[PDB]
């Protein structure tokens, strides 16, 4: 009404290859011998970078690993050959029929090598303990592909666990996750040994940190 | 040239929520001057714009919430949004569109605004200290509200080997880490401290990792 559809909605590909990312516009967005189609790049915690604009030209500052084309209701973005900040999601933005509107966006994943995670535990700090609390954090940092899973284990025994996850990195394509068990001063000192257990698909079994109080 | 968006990055429902943006380097009478929304959904709405003349255009849905003006003087450009709803949360941007392309080609870093009625709690800040030639530290940010918060690494000179993870609510307060590896040389042997911000609650803490 205008509606922009993008496709595919989510793609993978090998550094070196090709991306391609369709729009779709409900009706023609030409105007005076142009197409008012603009293409962005966005990645998490910053705004879109102005990619292409008017169908096919370039902006200033831009890569030229990124191509343009199309003209009515159809039109293309490609990247070739991907590197790896390009890792991100990408939107057709049309501002010549009212209302103006951005595409749904489409998820742009690099594919890598299987790599194994860096795993790291801490004990909590004195400045928690201080007041009522402990809270352990684990790092699995640097692995792909993006699934994964962790267990925490204390005093050899399997509540408290809040897990988040980092999006594809922009320089050499990992994922890493983050996870923190939470507990009471009390709760914490009564055990001696504390455990989280990475395991992923790039080993049949899993990493595994721990220390003892 | 340059945008910046600023206003509370917290109101309540009903309130209006109102924000600026401010240009540094050519004239809010030359170009189209825009707002632009961000969902947590991650889709994208184009608000409105005040064009150079103080000509406004608005996105249909948001005509009459929505205000769009300027001040000539100080070459900043305001958005008024009112009766604010839950679904007003998001992360606004205002945006410029320059003759030379007809596209949205400078972007302001953003501002995130959420709507809600909890209550503004600022973050503990907690060093996160070992219990190999590469060496993994962090700093634990536990228990504020509203997002978002900023973490960085000795200001900002040391950046290449750092996560930062998304924040994750739980029982309305929020909780995220950071981590950083360094050459496990280069600290202790140099100091290595995190700076986390959380605006909202005016809270700015730099931590030094210290061992043991």
């Known amino acids: 009404n205008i509606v922009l559809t993008q496709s595919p909605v989510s793609l993978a590909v090998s550094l070196g290859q090709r991306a391609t990312i369709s729009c779709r516009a409900s009706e023609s967005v030409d105007g005076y011998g142009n197409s008012f189609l603009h293409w962005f790049q966005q990645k998490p915690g910053q705004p879109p970078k102005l990619l292409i604009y008017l169908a096919s030209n370039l902006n200033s500052g831009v890569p030229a690993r990124f191509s343009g084309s199309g003209s009515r209701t159809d039109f293309t973005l490609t990247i070739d050959p991907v590197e790896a900040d390009d890792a991100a999601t990408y939107y057709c933005?049309?501002?010549?029929?009212?209302?103006?509107?951005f595409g749904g966006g489409t998820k742009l994943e690099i594919k890598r090598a299987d790599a194994a995670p860096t795993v790291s535990i801490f004990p909590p700090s004195s400045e928690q303990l201080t007041s009522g609390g402990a809270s352990v954090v684990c790092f699995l940092n640097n692995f792909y592909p993006k699934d994964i899973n962790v267990k925490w284990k204390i005093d050899g025994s399997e509540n408290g666990v809040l897990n988040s996850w980092t999006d594809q990195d922009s320089k050499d394509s990992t994922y890493s996750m983050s996870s923190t068990l939470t507990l009471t001063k009390d709760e914490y000192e009564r055990h001696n040994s504390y455990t989280c257990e990475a395991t992923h698909k790039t080993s049949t079994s899993p990493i595994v940190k721990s220390f003892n109080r | 040239v340059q945008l910046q968006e600023s206003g509370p990055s917290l109101v309540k429902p009903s309130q209006t929520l109102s924000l600026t943006c401010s240009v540094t380097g050519d004239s809010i009478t030359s170009g189209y001057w825009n707002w632009i929304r961000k969902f947590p959904g991650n889709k994208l709405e184009y608000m409105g714009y005040?064009?150079?003349?103080?000509?406004?255009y608005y996105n249909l849905s948001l005509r009459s919430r929505i205000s769009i003006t300027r001040d000539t003087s100080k070459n900043q450009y305001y958005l008024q949004l009112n009766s604010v709803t839950t679904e007003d949360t998001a992360t606004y941007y205002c945006?410029?569109?320059?003759?030379?392309?007809?596209?949205?080609?400078?972007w302001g870093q953003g501002t995130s605004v959420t709507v809600s009625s909890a209550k503004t709690t600022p973050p503990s800040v907690y060093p996160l200290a070992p219990g190999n030639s590469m060496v993994t530290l962090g700093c634990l940010v536990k228990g504020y509200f509203p997002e978002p918060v900023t973490v960085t690494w000795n200001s900002g000179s040391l950046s290449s080997g750092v996560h930062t993870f998304p924040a994750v609510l739980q029982s309305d307060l929020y909780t995220l880490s950071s981590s950083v590896t360094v050459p496990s040389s280069t600290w202790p042997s140099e100091t290595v401290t995190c700076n986390v911000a959380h605006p909202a609650s005016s809270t700015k803490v730099d931590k030094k990792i210290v061992p043991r």
């Open positions: 945006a410029l569109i320059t003759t030379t392309t007809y596209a949205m080609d400078y």
């Open positions: 005040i064009s150079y003349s103080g000509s406004t």
């Open positions: 933005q049309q501002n010549n029929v009212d209302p103006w509107t």
